[PDB]
Amino acid sequence: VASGCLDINSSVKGARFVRFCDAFNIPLITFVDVPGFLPGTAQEYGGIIRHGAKLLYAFAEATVPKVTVITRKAYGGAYDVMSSKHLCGDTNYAWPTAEIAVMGAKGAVEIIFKGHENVEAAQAEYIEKFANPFPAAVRGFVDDIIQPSSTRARICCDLDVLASKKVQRPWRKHANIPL
67, 29 Cβ separation under 8 angstroms = yes
To 10 degrees, what angle do helices 119-130 and 105-112 make? Answer: 130
10: number of Cβ within 10 Å? 19
Among 5, 29, 127, 145, binds ligand BTN (CB under 6 A): 5
Residues 12-51 within binding reach of ligand BTN (CB under 6 A): 35-39
Among 168, 173, 176, 179, binds a second copy (CB under 8 A): 168
Beta bridge partners of 30: 68
Minimum gap (Å) between residue 37 Cβ and ligand BTN = 6
Residue type, 36: G
173 binds a second copy (CB under 8 A): no
Burial of 58 (0-12, 13-18, 19+ CB in 10 A): buried
Minimum gap (Å) between residue 169 Cβ and a second copy = 8
Size of the site for a second copy (CB under 8 A): 3
Minimum gap (Å) between residue 5 Cβ and ligand BTN = 5
User: Which parts of this chain interact with a second copy (CB under 8 A)?
Assistant: 168-170
